């Protein structure tokens, strides 16, 4: 599956950001949401051809993408931050890199700091691309409905196979045992982060009109379905620890 993940890995997406324009929160947040829309088209194309995922019913595929989109987006952001800047900045796109200054102007400074902490962890662990690609699949399968999916057994089989796949990757001991522990603790830490990101996302989505924070059609459809489920307690995060 590791060779498959390397080939289907989505190419970098440009924000189309103009650096000579004013750094207002409305402009910054709207640019990032339009970027999220373009990135998510690739994410869904990547998901569609994943070994095992293609065997889940379409309704379970939609549920998993709607629950995990924020986690996949933040994890990929930290991956680019690590690979292009050695986790000094938040590399949203090649033409949109956040420093402390942009973080303050985006009106989401603490959440940016929270997303930066994950990039810092990637530098500390010296995360490999192979480890990253399996962890991304585990994030796609990290949240399910409270009453489970339509094909819960098929889901559990796929997820166990990807956990085993991560164990096989780190065994390439002692250090490999500590690595599996550290990579799975890092996966669980995404739940707390994503909970805070979605809180601000849901607020800006509700207050889109007053705030003038644009959302592309891709994000409107996902958030319209996701928001009622999360807010009513229908989401069930899956943890490796606790």
């Amino acid at each position: 599956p590791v060779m498959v993940l390397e080939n289907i890995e989505p190419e970098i997406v440009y924000a189309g950001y103009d650096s000579s324009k004013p750094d207002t929160a409305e402009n910054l947040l709207s640019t990032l949401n339009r970027l999220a829309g373009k990135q998510m088209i690739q994410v869904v194309k990547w998901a569609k051809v994943l070994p095992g995922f293609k065997n889940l019913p379409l309704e379970d595929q939609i549920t998993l993408i709607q629950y995990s989109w924020m986690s996949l987006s933040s994890f990929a952001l930290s991956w680019r931050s690590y690979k292009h800047t050695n986790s000094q900045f938040l590399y949203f796109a090649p033409d949109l890199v956040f420093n402390e200054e942009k973080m303050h102007q985006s009106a989401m400074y603490e959440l940016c700091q929270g997303m930066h902490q994950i990039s810092l962890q990637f530098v500390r662990l010296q995360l490999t691309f192979e480890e990253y690609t399996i962890m991304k699949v585990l994030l796609l399968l990290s949240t399910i409905p409270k009453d489970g999916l339509k094909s819960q057994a098929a889901f559990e089989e796929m997820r166990t196979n990807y956990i085993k796949e991560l164990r096989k990757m780190v065994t390439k001991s002692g250090q490999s045992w500590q690595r599996f522990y550290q990579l799975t603790k890092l996966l669980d830490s995404m739940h707390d982060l994503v909970s805070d990101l979605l809180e601000f996302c849901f607020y800006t989505f509700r207050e889109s009109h007053a705030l003038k924070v644009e959302f592309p059609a891709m994000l409107v459809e996902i958030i319209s379905d996701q928001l009622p489920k999360v807010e009513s307690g229908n989401a069930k995060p899956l943890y490796f620890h606790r």
Binding site: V44, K48, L58, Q61, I62, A217
Partner: peptide
């Protein structure tokens, strides 16, 4: 047909 539906059933 939603955008997620379209992209998963191409």
């Amino acid at each position: 047909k939603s955008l997620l539906q379209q992209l998963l059933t191409e």
